[PDB]
């Protein structure tokens, strides 16, 4: 009966009543009438026509929508898309949590790009590492003035930037003269670098490694490939 009336209601009317309908709990039906982007939106949150919600979003026109929505999407476990929205949002933090949990390089490159974006030094490093990229970690340091720290990495996992880098750090120190403050040596004397001969470089292990990076470590797994990184690793690594 009402439907005959329905033509003979418009804009705003629909809204009020929609709220009534919503009160009725005739959410779907409430959806059908739906009439305000906001109105549609909130209801949409309740409702979850997911795709449908997207169309309403269309171009959302507010990350806040995406943020709100992201939580919702994620709940529905409509991730493929969620990723698209979140990505669309480029809302890195939550998105990272998923991306990381299954794992992914690709995410990492784009993200790397992002990593560059973020404005505090630290996250970006994990990324660089995570990717496996000393190089990236070290380059990053150059901008931030992480210098003592950069040396440790450069030493540990040797890109022998310890030599290069140390000179520069030392130079800062140098600026701030005093001989102790200057501090000096790479192959020999103070440090014996390559003459010490101990644990962050060489070819053979490295060759084995070269491959290693390429295969999946294995134990028993899924399509989501292996790498391990534990006891075993220590042993071969020494070899």
């Amino acid at each position: 009966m009402a439907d005959k009336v329905l033509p003979t209601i418009p804009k705003e009317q629909r809204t009020r009543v929609a709220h009534f309908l919503e009160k009725q709990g005739f959410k779907q039906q409430a959806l059908t009438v739906s009439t305000d982007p906001e109105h549609r939106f909130e209801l949409a949150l309740q409702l979850g026509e997911l795709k449908i919600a997207y169309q309403l979003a269309v171009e959302a026109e507010s990350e806040q929508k995406w943020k709100q929505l992201a939580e919702l999407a994620i709940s529905k476990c409509q991730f493929s898309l969620a990723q698209e929205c979140l990505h669309h949002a480029q809302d890195y933090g939550g998105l990272l949590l998923l991306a990381t949990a299954s794992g992914n390089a690709s995410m990492v490159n784009k993200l790397a790009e992002g990593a560059e974006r973020d404005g505090k030094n630290n996250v970006a490093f994990m990324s660089y590492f995570l990717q496996g990229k000393l190089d990236a970690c070290l380059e990053l340091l150059i901008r931030t003035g992480r210098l003592p720290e950069a040396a440790f990495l450069a030493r540990t996992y040797l890109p022998s930037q310890v030599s290069r880098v140390v000179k520069l750090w030392r130079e800062n120190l140098s600026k701030v003269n005093q001989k102790a403050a200057e501090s000096l040596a790479d192959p020999t004397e103070y440090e014996n670098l390559f003459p010490g001969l101990k644990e962050a470089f060489v070819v053979e292990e490295w060759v084995k490694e070269t491959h290693a990076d390429l295969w999946p470590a294995k134990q028993y797994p899924l399509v989501t490939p292996n790498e391990e990184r534990n006891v075993m690793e220590e042993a071969k690594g020494f070899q």
Binding site: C77, Q78, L97, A105, L130, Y157, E199, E205, L222
Partner: protein
């Protein structure tokens, strides 16, 4: 300090520390223990924070252990239905094979 420990090419100290801060709660931090590692135990805890078998699967599958994550997931009345890219594809690799150190201890000189 943990960072120093992972920088260096050795494994325990971070792990006790990991215990002792895991043990001091967490929602975003477990991550620290996992990467340089393969294996994590965090997952036992983690699932409890999540507990949607989702995290548990994503994480799970490779030790050849996707499976328990599914068992619960089913029990619940599952809710997963779509996923995004993420297939383990970034390198947790680097650190210190023989010749050209670590640095537990770092020598220098005033000279």
């Amino acid at each position: 300090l943990s960072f120093l420990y992972l920088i260096t090419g050795n494994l325990e100290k971070l792990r006790k520390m990991m215990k002792i801060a895991e043990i001091r709660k967490d929602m975003s931090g477990h991550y620290q223990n996992a990467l340089y590692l393969g294996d994590v135990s965090e997952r036992v805890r983690i699932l409890k924070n999540c507990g949607q078998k989702s995290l548990a699967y994503l994480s799970a599958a490779t030790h050849g252990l996707d499976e328990e994550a599914e068992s619960l997931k089913e029990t619940f009345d599952p809710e997963k239905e779509t996923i995004p890219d993420i297939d383990p594809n970034a390198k947790l690799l680097q650190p210190p094979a023989p010749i050209m150190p670590l640095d537990t201890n770092w020598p220098l000189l005033t000279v």
